[PDB]
Ligand SMILES: CC(C)(COP(=O)(O)OP(=O)(O)OC[C@H]1O[C@@H](n2cnc3c(N)ncnc32)[C@H](O)[C@@H]1OP(=O)(O)O)[C@@H](O)C(=O)NCCC(=O)NCCS
């Protein structure tokens with residue numbers, strides 16, 4: 086009641102920036118949900134709003150959705166899917182099983198995206214050419230994250246890579262780091 | 270300032286009853302930590318303070334410790350240890366691996382203690398005799414939780430069960446539910462030699478007996494503690510030791526990323542859909 | 543049948559070293575469960591068997607039990623207990639609530655034990671004296687993990703630290719790293735009263751001393767157990783007891799679903815982005 | 816000053832590179848040849864840390880260590896006199912020269928096909944003035960039945 090009369094000040098212990106739900110309309114980082122839906126955003130646009138607080142162009146949202154599609158699943162043999170299946174066959178509910186699967190996502194399983202981006206960006210930001218980057222990684226006894234496949238060597242390329250690469254060619258305005266990685 | 274002067278009243282959003290860290294000394298459910306250690310209350314006593322807010326008798330504390338020791342680990346083949354090993358071999362930290370192992374603890378894995386306690390308590394609270402209980406369980410198509418071992422049948426009993434039974438006999442004042450469970454075990458071993466009282470069933474019935482006969486809990490308090498999952502907590506805390514041991518062991522052995530063999534998986538996918 | 547006849551060899555995908563359950567008797571690191579129980583090993587002895595595969599001396603086991611006791615709980619204000627209480631009040635089970643609380647254990651909450659042990663071991667192994675170590679920490683703007691508490695200070699000591707320190711003084715054979723940490727504590731307290739040795743720092747340095755001087759480990763074995771996160775496991779196992787106590791408390795108090803008040807959250811959103 | 820004997824019944828080998836099938840065939844040959852101990856003592860692979868890898872001695876499992884650096888394997892295996900280099904043509908030169916830095920190795924087998932002839936010349940010069948025999952590059956290796964087998968020589972069991 087003293088808060089409804091403006092008699093008390095209290096510091097706020099938490100800060101948030103992604104979503105406002107106190108008001109009449111749900112707001113996703115400064116944008117109402119009706120505005121979100123009327124301009125034909127999708128999972129990618131809402132993801133951009135919630136994670137980056139930015140208005141990504143339509144091709145960026147479509148690319149994010151494609152990235153979610155290609156990484157959706159890779160069979161039951163991987164560590165996370167194995168853990169999820171073990172926890173599901175133990176009679177646990179959906180949240181516990183998915184959680185037990187997700188908790189294996191880290192360096193050895195599922196961290197190749199972030200590691201590959203980090204090391205390719207670190208190389209590209211420095212002036213070293215791809216050949217020097219390969220030699221430098223060879224010298225330190227460290228494999229290049231993002232390079233390597235059990236199959237799909239030559240003339241039979243990996244098809245998810247092909248789809249994503251073609252989309253990035255034909256929609257992105259500039260792909261410097263992609264060209265660097267392609268030279269590598 | 271308004272709260273200090275007493276102008277404003279604001280309800281507290283949290284209630285706690287197990288520990289007080291505000292004061293000059295840490296207090297475990299009304300007992301200071303120095304009093305906890307001076308009274309030689311081991312892990313069992315601290316567990317009793319933090320889980321039941323009771324100072325249990327020394328035999329109860331030792332029994333709780335024994336229950337934690339018997340359930341500490343049961344090899345790497347179980348679901349929880351398997352998940353912990355997989356998460357450790359994936360390079361995750363201790364908390365993630367132990368957590369991934371613990372998340373499998375539920376009805377099928379690890380819930381035998383609580384289920385056996387609930388079943389035996391439900392049978393004993395009603396007036397049905399052990400034979401009527403066995404026949405009722407058989408008629409309902411339900412196996413008796415806490416009955417049945419894979420190898421230990423007769424004259425080669427489960428040694429963990431024997432150790433816990435000896436402690437309960439020579440230390441507990443009264444164990445009516447344990448006697449009821451042992452009558453049930455006699456019936457089921459007459460049926461089939463290996464249908465002996467598990468460590469799960471023994472732990473459940475002896476824990477119910479401890480709650481109901483240690484002299485610290487009312488009947489409704491013990492019933493509530495069994496209902497809210499105190500035995501689930503006992504199993505989880507005990508098995509956390511083995512799970513952390515498995516994580517440390519996989520780290521020390523420097524095991525690599527695990528991928529399940531393709532020949533062990535039956536791929537049955539839709540043809541066109 | 544082919545494996546029994548020995549006609550086929552198939553590599554084993556897993557290695558384990560802590561527990562064998564295949565035989566007649568359960569075995570904890572090469573030691574039968576009845577042998578564990580008959581010579582009065584406690585939670586500490588079983589923990590030593592499962593985590594280090596070593597037969598620790600009695601004082602080491604008692605010190606491990608004391609470490610599990612002192613870190614059992616520190617009230618509901620900490621991040622992990624907060625998360626466990628929130629998840630318990632959301633209607634979730636014991637495993638989910640305890641797990642949600644445990645997942646906050648890491649660098650900022652609960653990681654001062656392992657960081658303190660690592661830093662003090664690194665300082666002691668190098669030839670830097672405590673004064674030089676404090677000055678070097680000051681130069682890099684890096685806080686000494688295991689030093690400094692808010693409520694307690696000199697002339698009002700942390701009593702958990704006092705209990706553990708007394709036990710280590712009158713039971714451990716040699717505590718070089720503890721003495722090093724005590725010299726660092728004297729220097730920092732002369733600098734400023736609140737910069738005393740924490741329970742985290744004391745446990746870390748005394749655990750390193752126990753590993754290096756109990757006689758059951760070589761230098762590199764103790765080093766690798768410290769590195770792989772044995773003290774993380776010590777803190778997690780200790781605090782799981784308190785988190786389960788908090789879950790049981792919240793279930794017993796019948797607390798409802800929790801929602802953070804809007805007036806405590808500062809909303810700062812883009813204009814139309 | 817080369818040696819007149821270079822494979823023995825009690826010879827030991829370091830394998831450079833991650834070649835599990837080659838060393839497993841080596842161990843199968845050793846077991847069938849009634850060897851007391853396996854001929855492969857350790858493996859060197861710069862791209863993974865020091866660990867141990869499972870292998871089959873007949874029907875039982877043994878652990879063969881794998882090292883980041885040739886130095887550690889060289890230090891803690893003083894009984895090794897043979898190195899089988901599975902390094903590619905780009906790293907065969909450096910690996911071979913680094914091996915020739917160690918005097919305990921009397922035999923080096925080079926498997927890589929396509930080493931430039933000048934680098935091979937320098938390898939010959941270093942080996943000749945170091946007294947180390949070289950099973951030349953672009954080879955499968957060699958086999959002394961009952962004693963030792965290089966890599967994939969003679970196929971599988
Ligand atoms: C990517 C990388 C692992 C390539 O692996 P590889 O050694 O060429 O092949 P794999 O490790 O997949 O496994 C090799 C074999 O095991 C098989 N295999 C894979 N999963 C299996 C499973 N669950 N069960 C049985 N067999 C399996 C493969 O079919 C392959 O068969 P082959 O021997 O007939 O070729 C390696 O180049 C690398 O680590 N690169 C670093 C960059 C990176 O990490 N990329 C991110 C990964 S998406």
Ligand SMILES: CC(C)(COP(=O)(O)OP(=O)(O)OC[C@H]1O[C@@H](n2cnc3c(N)ncnc32)[C@H](O)[C@@H]1OP(=O)(O)O)[C@@H](O)C(=O)NCCC(=O)NCCS
Nearest residue numbers: 654684685686687688689690691692736737740741742743
């Ligand atoms: C426990 C802790 C968070 C309390 O810090 P605090 O309340 O900010 O302490 P202060 O009020 O003195 O503020 C920090 C000041 O003391 C010094 N200080 C605080 N903790 C320090 C430490 N562990 N080592 C060295 N110096 C420290 C800082 O240099 C700073 O000095 P300044 O005021 O001249 O800039 C802090 O001591 C710390 O981070 N300790 C290390 C981590 C740790 O031990 N975890 C807790 C285990 S239960």
Ligand SMILES: CC(C)(COP(=O)(O)OP(=O)(O)OC[C@H]1O[C@@H](n2cnc3c(N)ncnc32)[C@H](O)[C@@H]1OP(=O)(O)O)[C@@H](O)C(=O)NCCC(=O)NCCS
Nearest residue numbers: 088106107108109282799800801802803804805806807808
């Ligand atoms: C849906 C249902 C809870 C309606 O809620 P309610 O009790 O009328 O009001 P709320 O639970 O939203 O919250 C009470 C008030 O506190 C306020 N409030 C809610 N969360 C708050 C927070 N975190 N901080 C501060 N204030 C808050 C709300 O604005 C609300 O305003 P009011 O005073 O105008 O009612 C109720 O109709 C119901 O239980 N129905 C069953 C159907 C159901 O469960 N639906 C699921 C909802 S997704």
